[PDB]
Write a protein that binds this ligand. Structure first.
Ligand SMILES: N[C@H]1CCN(S(=O)(=O)c2ccccc2)C1
Ligand SMILES: N[C@H]1CCN(S(=O)(=O)c2ccccc2)C1
Ligand SMILES: N[C@H]1CCN(S(=O)(=O)c2ccccc2)C1
Ligand SMILES: N[C@H]1CCN(S(=O)(=O)c2ccccc2)C1
Ligand SMILES: N[C@H]1CCN(S(=O)(=O)c2ccccc2)C1
Ligand SMILES: N[C@H]1CCN(S(=O)(=O)c2ccccc2)C1
Ligand SMILES: N[C@H]1CCN(S(=O)(=O)c2ccccc2)C1
Ligand SMILES: N[C@H]1CCN(S(=O)(=O)c2ccccc2)C1
Ligand SMILES: N[C@H]1CCN(S(=O)(=O)c2ccccc2)C1
Ligand SMILES: N[C@H]1CCN(S(=O)(=O)c2ccccc2)C1
Ligand SMILES: N[C@H]1CCN(S(=O)(=O)c2ccccc2)C1
Ligand SMILES: N[C@H]1CCN(S(=O)(=O)c2ccccc2)C1
Ligand SMILES: N[C@H]1CCN(S(=O)(=O)c2ccccc2)C1
Ligand SMILES: N[C@H]1CCN(S(=O)(=O)c2ccccc2)C1
Ligand SMILES: N[C@H]1CCN(S(=O)(=O)c2ccccc2)C1
Ligand SMILES: N[C@H]1CCN(S(=O)(=O)c2ccccc2)C1
Ligand SMILES: N[C@H]1CCN(S(=O)(=O)c2ccccc2)C1
Ligand SMILES: N[C@H]1CCN(S(=O)(=O)c2ccccc2)C1
Lengths: 348, 348, 348, 348, 348
C-alpha cells in the first residue's frame, strides 16, 4: 500500500523509507514536500531532480543507506539500473539511475530483475542482500558487489572507500571494500587491472602514504630531490604555476590541498556530478592566475608517480591511456628533450 | 487510510472520491496531478486554487455530488465551513470554504462539528445525511438544509434551484428546493422574507413567466404599454441605452439576453465568483457603448416589476433595500417629477 | 545542427519543424516558449506535457503532419514508440509516446529502430516513408501501416478515419484508410476481425447510415418498431433513462447526440485521453439525473444492433467480449425472462 | 501613492485602474493575482505576459479603455511606446509595448515623453488627451491620432475601426475613425495612400458591400461571371482548392468564411499576434486538404478585386507591393498565357 | 549560429562560452538548465535573475572572465551597458546591465557600440580588447579602462583591485589596476580625486598598512594613544559599542573583522548588491547588542583617519561629503565640545 502520506510518515518517523505503516498530512508546493507538525508546515524534501516532486521524494526516501559503491564506479562499469534499491547520487541530489526495479510504481520497469526487460540492462546486484549473488548468476548483464568470496567467480578487489549516506569513507565499523564482478551477455568478464581515485576533499585532505606526508610537509625542491622527480615537471603538474594569467598545471588533488593551506582559491564545478576526472574553472585568489578547464584527479601520489615514471618521454605530444576506477582515462603527455613538460588527464 | 494514490484511484475508477480501496501511480508537476495510463501521463486535475495541488485535488475529489445550495446562498447566510462535505465552487474552480470538518487531514480544523473550534463558525449541515439535523440542533452557529419538516423548526422555503456538479437546475429526477434554517449564537433565527435570483445564463436564457415571454417577443414600446410601465424607466434600466459613450442602465439579465440575440457584447467578469448581484465591464460590439461597472441581477421580470412598482417616486435620490437570496440588496432609486430616471443594484 | 532557436525558426517560418536552416530569438518562461517579434514576445508554445518545456516544444514541432492512426488504435495494438516520427496526442496535448527514435536528442533511445534497445518495444512504422516497410520486416516487435499491399504480408483493413493535425476525418484529398500489420517476438500476428468506433463528436454528430438517420429523426417507439428492437432495452441503453437520480443507460454516442439536441448536459471527461470506450461523469441539466461513471462508445448504430442481436438472452448476468478497434471490449449483458435489461461496455 | 493593493482596490471597485484611493488584501501565487472576498480567494488576474505578475497586473489595470488603434496599425507605423497610457494587446494578453512613460514605476523609462530617453523612440500620442498634440509637435519621433484637424498638420484618414476593450468595432456611440500623423527624426512624414484590412472574424463574418453579399450568396461560377473575374484565378485564390493533399489558395478571409458555413476546418494560429497578413496551418475537416503556411488577409472583396485587376498579367512570377494598413505588403503574382495562376500575400 | 545547445556545449567543454562549434542535449525545468551526461541530467545553471532562464544562461556563459572593474565602480561612474561583453554581477548572481551590445540576440540593443541607440548610453569600453580605445574616442558617452597610457587622454588611476570570476583581488599574475577615462556628451571628463574602498571580506580580512596591523594587534587604548586619536570617537565608530540594546557605531570593516576574531555576529545583507557603502542588520551573538541599519564601509584605516582628522568639529550635526569609488558619499558628523560623538556613512 504505497502512498505519498506513507512515504512521508516513514521519513518523519524512521529518517527514511522503512516499510512502516502510517500516514502524515502532506502538502506539495512547487518542488517541495511539507508535512504538518502541530499546525505548521515543515519541509521534508526539496526536489533538485528532473523527476516529478512526489516521485523524487519517494526515491530519495527509498535510497540505499548501507555503504554503496561511489556513483563514478557504477558509471565506469556501465551500470544502468539497480536491483530493488535506489543508489542516491549525492553529487547531483538525484537518483543515480533513471529507472528502478521493485522500488517505486512511477519509475519501475519491472518488479524483479529476472523480468525480460532487465536482461539487456547492466543491473547492479548487492551480494549483501539475500538472493542477489544468485540473481547475478542468472542475469544476462550485471555488476555484483560482495564482502567475500563467490564460488567459482574470481573477484576484482574494488576501492577501499564506499559512499554511506553521501559520505565517502573507508569503513572501520562497516565494510566499504567490495569484490566486484561483472557479466556482459551471460559471460563473466575479467575486470581489468586498475588504479583507484582516492575520493578526498580539498578542505579535509589527509595523506595516505609517506610520500603524501612528505609532499605536504616538505618544500617543493626538497620533495622532488627526495623522490628523484627531476625532469618529471611536478613543479608545473602537481605544485601548480601561478606566475602567468593562465594557471599552469595543478592536476592532482594533493597539490590543490597543499596550495589551499597557504592561500585560498575558487573552484567552479561547472559539471556537478561524480566522475573519475573532475573539470574546474579555477581562480587563484592570491595571484589572479586562472584556468577555464583545469582537470583534476585525486590519485594517491605514489600511483601518479608510478604512472608518469612508466612512460616513454621521447615524443612531443602523445595520448597515455590509464585504467582508473575501471575506466580508460586519456592523459596528454607533452615532452621536450627527454623531460616532461606537462601530463594531464582529460575529461571526456 | 487516506492517500494521494488512493484519491487518484477513486477519481480514475469512480469519477470522484467514493471511499474505495486501491492505488494508482501519480505524478505531481507544478499545479497538475497526472496518472500513468499504459505508459503515458494523463491529466487528472489542474489546481486553480490557492491551496497546495495535492490538497486541492483531494477536496475536489471529495466534492459534494448531490444538488447543493448555490455558493451565493451559502455566502449570503454567512456559512463559514461545511460539516463532513466539500461544497465545490465551480465558478472559482475552488472549495467554497477554506477549512473542512472530517474531510481532509491538511484542511480539517476538526473531525466532527461538535468540536469546540466549530462553535463560533457557521457550519453548513445537510439534513439529507444521517445525524446532521441533530448536529445543527447542537451547533452554536449553523445553516441547515432539509427536504422536509424538522419538528418544531420554522422553515424558510429556499430557491427552486440548486447546483448539481456545477450545473444549476430545478430538479425533476432529484429534489433541489430545500428548507433553510439558521442559528446564530445558539439561537435559531427567523430568516427574512426574500426574492430569489433565477441563476440563468446569457447564452441559454429561458423565460419563466408570460411577462418574460412578452419581454423577449414584443418590441420595447408595446411591452411597456401592455404592462403599464410608463414612467418606470424600463427603456434605460432594462432595455439599455446604447446611444452615448457610457452604456445606460442594462441591470436586468433578461435585458442583456434580449440585446444578445440581436447583437453581441463583451462582459468582463472582473470579480469571478457567485454573487446575487454581478458587476461587469460591458462593451457593446455594435455601438461601442461601454460601462466599467455595470451591476446585473437576474430577477424574474415580474419580481423586478413588483419591486419598482412598490416604491415612492417623490424623492430625487434614495436607497431602496430589497431582500434577495436572503441578503439585503441596496438599490439606488433616482426620480424626477414623479417618474423613475434610474433604479440600479449596488454590489457591496 | 539541432537547436531550440532552429526549432522556433521552423515553427515561425514553416508552421512546424521542416528541417530548414535558421534561428529566431527565444525566451523560455515557466512552461511557455516565446519568440521576439518586433520588440515584443509572442507565444509559440505552452507546455501541457510532463516533459521539459524545450523538449516538448521540439516534439510538438516535429509532430507527424500526415494523417496518422488515432492514438486509441495505436494503444490497442500495443505501440510503445514510433520510428523516426512523433505521433502527437491532441487529446492530451502531449506526445503519444514517452521516447523517440531518430527525432530528438533528449528523448531518443536510438537513432534507428534497428538498434537492439528497440527490439523488445513495439515500434510504429509508416509504410508511406521510404525504408519503413523493410524496417518492420527486420523489427522484433512492431506495427506497420501502409496505403497498399506488402508482398506476402496478410493485411488488416483499418478504420476509414485517421487523425490529420488533430482532426479525425475520412480523407477525400488524402488517404486515411490504412492496412495494418503487427509483429510480436519476430512473428507476424493475425490481427483479429473487428468493429471500429466512429470517432464522432457530440456537437457535430452526423449519421452514417439510414438506421442512424431514422434514430435521430424518429421518436423512440416508432424507431424500435421499425427496426424490430422490442425486448432489447434500447429505451434504457441507447435513449437513456432520466427519471431517477441515477441516469440509466445512455452508452451509445448517438443517444447522447439525440438528447443533446433537445436539452443540454454536462460530460465530465475525468480521464482525458483517446480510448475506444470513454467514461464520463454525466449530469443532465433538464432533470438533474446523473451518473459518476457512464461508459460511452461511438459504434455505428447498425453495428451495435448486430452485436446485441447476436447474443443469447437466457442468463441473468454475463460478460460479452467484442473486438472493437482491435481490442477486446467487455460488455455486461443483463437479462430477465428472455429480454435485455441492460448491456454496457466496461472501460478497463 | 502607487501600490499593488491600491491597483487591486481599483480593479475590484472600478473595473480597472481609475486613480481611486483604497486598498484590498491581495495574494500572489505563481502568475495569478487574488483578492480575499469574504474569507475566500477570488482571481483578479492571470499573467500571460513575460513581465513579473504584479507588474503585468498594474499595466493591464492601467490599460486604455477608450477606442484605440488596433495593434497591427501601431506596429505598421513603427510605434515603440505610448505616452502616458498602456495599449493592451488582447490578441497576446499582454502590453503592446515593453516599456511605459508615466504609467508604472517598474516599466517606466520616463515620466514625460519630453525626456531625452524618448527622443529616439516612436511615441504614440493620443490627441484626445490634453497636451498630447503639443507633445507630438515637440517629440523627435512619434505617431499621433486625433478626432479632428490639427492646424497645419496634413492628416491621414485611418481605418473606420478601432479596438475598444479588445472588441474591434466601427463606433456609433464613440468615434473610432482617427486622423493619423507620424514624425521621423523631428520631421513630419507623409503617410502613404493605403488600403485597410477589415478586421473581421471567421465565425461572425459580415459582408460590407454588394460584391461581398454576392460572393456569400452566389455559387462560384455565377459570381465570377457577374463580376467579370474570368482569368483572375478566384477559384484557387479566393474560393480555395480542396482537391489535392496541399490546400490550394484560400488567401482572403471572405473565402474562408464562405467555406466555414458549409464545412468546418482547423486554423492553427502558430504566431498569435495582430498583423495585417495572418499565417495559419489550415486543415480542412471534410477533405483532409491541408497547408502548413496559408497566408490570409481580410481585405474588402472590392479592394482585392481592384488590386488584382490593376496588375500586368504578362510575366511568369513577380512581386506586387501593396500598401495595406500603412505597411508595404508583398504579394506573389504568378501568371501563364495572360491569366492569373495564383496571387498571394507574404507575411515577412 | 547561436543556440541554447551550443551555449551548453561550450559550458560543458570550455567552462564558459568560447565560440566553439557543437551541441549537447539540454532540458529546461523551471529556472534550471540541465544537460544529459550518459543517461542522467546534470545541472548546468540555476537562474537567480529576473531574465528568462535560457537568456540568463547565455549571458552568464558569455560573462567576462578577465579581471574587470567591480560593479560598484561601474555603477558609480554611471555605466549603463558594456561593449561586446557581459559584466556578471556575482553579488546579485545576475548581469550587471539590463541590455547588451553584440552579445545575445534577446538582450542586444545593437551589434556595435557605434550604433546610434548607444550614443546616449554610457558604454563600458575595455582598452585591453582591440579597437575599444578607438571606439571610446568616437563614443558620445562612455567609460574606458586601460592597462597603460592613452595618447592625449589624462588618466585616473583606479583601484588596485578588480573582480576576476567573482573573486576580488589585487593581481600578481594579471593586471587589476586600470586607468579610467570617462566621456560625457563627447567631452573627456576630469575624474575627481577619490578614495577607494578596499573590498575585503570579514572572514579573510588582511591589513594593508602598519596602522591596520596595529589596529588588529593592539588593544583599543594603546592604538588610540599611538595614533593620537583621542576625541575622534574611534571607541564608538570603529571598535563598536556593544553595551546597550542598540549596537553603537561599528562602521568600518576593519572593526567588524577585529570583533569577529573574538566573538561572532550575524550580518543580514538585506540589499544584496555591490555598493561602496553596505547596510547590514547586525546582531552581536555574545551580547545581544543589535542595529537594524548599520552602515559599513571598507576604507583603509589610514584613509578613514585622514578623512575624520580633516573635518571641522565645531557643529552639532553636519553632512560631510567624501568622494569614494568616484561617487559622493554623505557621512553624518556629530560633535559636542570640539570632539566627535559619531561619524557614519549613509547608503542612499
Ligand atoms: N523490492 C523491495 C526492496 C526495496 N523496496 S522499498 O520500497 O524501497 C522498501 C524498503 C524498506 C522496507 C520496505 C520496502 C522493496
Ligand atoms: N564491528 C566490528 C566487527 C567486524 N568489523 S567490520 O565492520 O566487518 C570490518 C572489518 C575489517 C575492516 C573494516 C570493517 C568491526
Ligand atoms: N570536457 C567535457 C567533454 C564531455 N564532458 S562530460 O559530458 O561532462 C562527461 C563526463 C563524464 C563522462 C562522460 C562525459 C566534459
Ligand atoms: N466525514 C465523512 C463524510 C465525508 N468524508 S470523505 O473523506 O470526503 C468520504 C467520502 C466518500 C466516501 C468515504 C469518505 C468522511
Ligand atoms: N425519481 C422520481 C420520483 C420522485 N422524485 S423526487 O426526487 O423525490 C422529486 C420530488 C419533488 C420534485 C422533484 C423531484 C423523482
Ligand atoms: N432575527 C433576524 C435578524 C437577521 N437574521 S439572520 O438569520 O441571523 C440572517 C443573517 C444574514 C442573512 C440572512 C439571515 C434573523
Ligand atoms: N463593487 C465592489 C465593492 C466590493 N466588492 S466585493 O469585494 O467583490 C464584495 C462582493 C459581495 C460581498 C462583499 C464584497 C465589489
Ligand atoms: N529521422 C528523421 C525523420 C524525422 N526526423 S525530424 O528530426 O523530426 C525532421 C523532420 C523534418 C525535417 C527534418 C528533420 C529525422
Ligand atoms: N488528389 C486526389 C487524387 C487521388 N487522391 S488519393 O489521395 O490518393 C485518395 C484515394 C482514395 C481515397 C481518398 C483519397 C485525391
Ligand atoms: N494470433 C493472435 C493473438 C493476438 N494477436 S496480436 O496481433 O498480437 C494483437 C494483440 C493485441 C491487440 C490486437 C492484436 C494475434
Ligand atoms: N474505469 C477505469 C478503470 C481503469 N481505467 S484506465 O486507467 O483509465 C485504463 C483505460 C484503458 C486501458 C487501460 C486502463 C478506467
Ligand atoms: N501619466 C498619467 C496618465 C496615465 N497614468 S495612470 O497611472 O495609468 C492613471 C490612470 C487613471 C487614473 C490615475 C492614473 C498617469
Ligand atoms: N453620443 C452620440 C452623439 C455624437 N456621437 S460621436 O461619438 O461624437 C460620433 C461621431 C461620428 C461617428 C460616430 C460617433 C454619438
Ligand atoms: N516620406 C515617406 C517615406 C515613408 N514614410 S513614413 O511616414 O515614415 C512610414 C513608415 C512606415 C510605415 C508607414 C509610414 C513617408
Ligand atoms: N512567415 C514568417 C516570417 C517571419 N515572421 S514574423 O516573425 O512573425 C513577422 C511578422 C510581421 C512582421 C515582421 C516579422 C512570419
Ligand atoms: N561581439 C563579440 C564579443 C562577445 N561576443 S560572444 O558571443 O560572447 C563570444 C565570446 C567568445 C567567442 C565568440 C563569441 C561576440
Ligand atoms: N606574468 C608576469 C609578467 C608581468 N606580469 S603582470 O601580470 O602584467 C603584472 C605586473 C605588475 C603588477 C601586477 C601584474 C607578471
Ligand atoms: N538606505 C537605503 C536608501 C536607498 N538605498 S538603495 O536602494 O539600496 C541604493 C543603493 C546604492 C545606490 C543607490 C541606492 C538604501
Amino acid at each position: 500500500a504505497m502512498s505519498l502520506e506513507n512515504v512521508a510518515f516513514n521519513v518523519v518517523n524512521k529518517g527514511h523509507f522503512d516499510g512502516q505503516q502510517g500516514e502524515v498530512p502532506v502538502s506539495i508546493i512547487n518542488n517541495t514536500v511539507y508535512t504538518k507538525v502541530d499546525g505548521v508546515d515543515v519541509e521534508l524534501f526539496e526536489n533538485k531532480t528532473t523527476l516529478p516532486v512526489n516521485v523524487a521524494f519517494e526515491l530519495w526516501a527509498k535510497r540505499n543507506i548501507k555503504p554503496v559503491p561511489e556513483v563514478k564506479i557504477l558509471n565506469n562499469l556501465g551500470v544502468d539500473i539497480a536491483a530493488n534499491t535506489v543508489i542516491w547520487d549525492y553529487k547531483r541530489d538525484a537518483p543515480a539511475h533513471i529507472s528502478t526495479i521493485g522500488v517505486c510504481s512511477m519509475t519501475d520497469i519491472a518488479k524483479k530483475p529476472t523480468e525480460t526487460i532487465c536482461a539487456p540492462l547492466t543491473v547492479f546486484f548487492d551480494g549483501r542482500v539475500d538472493g542477489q549473488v544468485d540473481l547475478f548468476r542468472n542475469a544476462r548483464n550485471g555488476v555484483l558487489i560482495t564482502e567475500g568470496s563467490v564460488k567459482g567467480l574470481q573477484p576484482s578487489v574494488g576501492p577501499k572507500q564506499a559512499s554511506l549516506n553521501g559520505v565517502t569513507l573507508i569503513g572501520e565499523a562497516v565494510k566499504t571494500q567490495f569484490n566486484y564482478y561483472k557479466k556482459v551477455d551471460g559471460v563473466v568478464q575479467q575486470l581489468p587491472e586498475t588504479y583507484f581515485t582516492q575520493s578526498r576533499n580539498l578542505q579535509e585532505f589527509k595523506p595516505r602514504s609517506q610520500m603524501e606526508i612528505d609532499f605536504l610537509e616538505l618544500a617543493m625542491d626538497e620533495f622532488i630531490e627526495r623522490y628523484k622527480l627531476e625532469g618529471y615537471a611536478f613543479e608545473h603538474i602537481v605544485y601548480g604555476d601561478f606566475s602567468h594569467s593562465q594557471l599552469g598545471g595543478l592536476h592532482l588533488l594533493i597539490g590543490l590541498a597543499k596550495r589551499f593551506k597557504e592561500s585560498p582559491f575558487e573552484l567552479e564545478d561547472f559539471i556537478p556530478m561524480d566522475s573519475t576526472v573532475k573539470n574546474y574553472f579555477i581562480t587563484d585568489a592570491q595571484t589572479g592566475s586562472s584556468k577555464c578547464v583545469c582537470s583534476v584527479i585525486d590519485l594517491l601520489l605514489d600511483d601518479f608517480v608510478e604512472i608518469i615514471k612508466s612512460q616513454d618521454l621521447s615524443v612531443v605530444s602523445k595520448v597515455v591511456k590509464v585504467t582508473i576506477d575501471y575506466t580508460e582515462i586519456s592523459f596528454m603527455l607533452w615532452c621536450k628533450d627527454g623531460h616532461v613538460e606537462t601530463f594531464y588527464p582529460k575529461l571526456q
